[PDB]
Fold this sequence. Notes:
Elements: H1 2-16, E1 23-28, E2 35-45, E3 56-62, E4 73-76, H2 108-120, H3 130-138, H4 140-153
Antiparallel strand pairs: 1-2, 2-3, 3-4
The structure holds sodium ion.
Pathway: Protein modification; protein sumoylation
GO molecular function: ATP binding; ligase activity; SUMO conjugating enzyme activity
Protein name: SUMO-conjugating enzyme UBC9
Amino acid sequence: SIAKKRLAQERAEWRKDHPAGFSAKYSPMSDGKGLDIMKWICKIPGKKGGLWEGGEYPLTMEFTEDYPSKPPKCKFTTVLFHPNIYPSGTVCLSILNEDEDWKPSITIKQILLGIQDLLDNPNPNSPAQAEPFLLYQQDRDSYEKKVKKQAIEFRPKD
Ligand code: NA
């Protein structure tokens, strides 16, 4: 399997060197036996200095056997109040779109860093979630207030 060979390489390279505060692991098999290389459970820290700082945002990455020709579906497991996150949790981002900027050479680290950056830099051309898209425009101060509040709720649980 080209997909599983690449995923094992991505995981090995991730364990050797990855950005602090991030996590990217195989998710547990539903039957309890072993790990699912095709579905990763990840965590993204809010970037320092931005509205999401202090929060830890869990996300899944789902791969198919067409990986790396096909990008993973990346989904926050709790939907974030952000214009480019679908109500499903799916991240709307051009490097995650096969027909836009996805390339087989894109790494897991590049995906997670790209999503972290997206959090701080909403894209007005790709609205995916009505309420944060509208609030961002109606009153950015109020948008900031809501995001900061959510960031506190996503601080790692004590
Ligand atoms: Na949710």
